[PDB]
Structure 1
């Protein structure tokens, strides 16, 4: 998926259940494979310490 535009997409669908997990990942903004390549994550890779809050928007 990393070699495709599919990596960005989170697939949701209709299932005969409830309470199933969609996704999950750890909170490591500079180190986690999920955030290492984002603008904020790339900026963090030039620094040793980080401290603040983090906004996550879902569309």
Structure 2
């Protein structure tokens, strides 16, 4: 509800099976993407095309 270091953290629960960790659409100019450097630059242009690289680092 207010910007926090915690919205960068995707939590994981021990022992859950089959279940879903997170979900998002890919509107790179809006939503989660919007404040990232990528999101932030994309917004200076009208059209984009290309591949995106999404990585997850485990802690």
- TM-score, normalised with respect to structure 2: 0.86
* Residue number in structure 1 paired with 2:41: 43
Q: Name the structure where helix makes up a greater proportion of residues.
A: 2
Where structure 1 has 5 or more consecutive residues not aligned to the other structure, the ranges are: none
Three-state SS of the structure 1 residue aligned to 2:33 is: coil
Residue 13 of structure 1 and its aligned partner are, at CA, apart by 1.3
Provide the aligned length of Structure 1 versus Structure 2: 57
What is the distance in 2 between the residues matched to 1:55 and 1:14? Answer: 27
**Cα RMSD (Å) of the superposition?**
1.3
Where structure 2 has 5 or more consecutive residues not aligned to the other structure, the ranges are: none
Three-state SS of the structure 1 residue aligned to 2:6 is: helix
- Segments ≥4 residues shifted beyond 6 Å: none
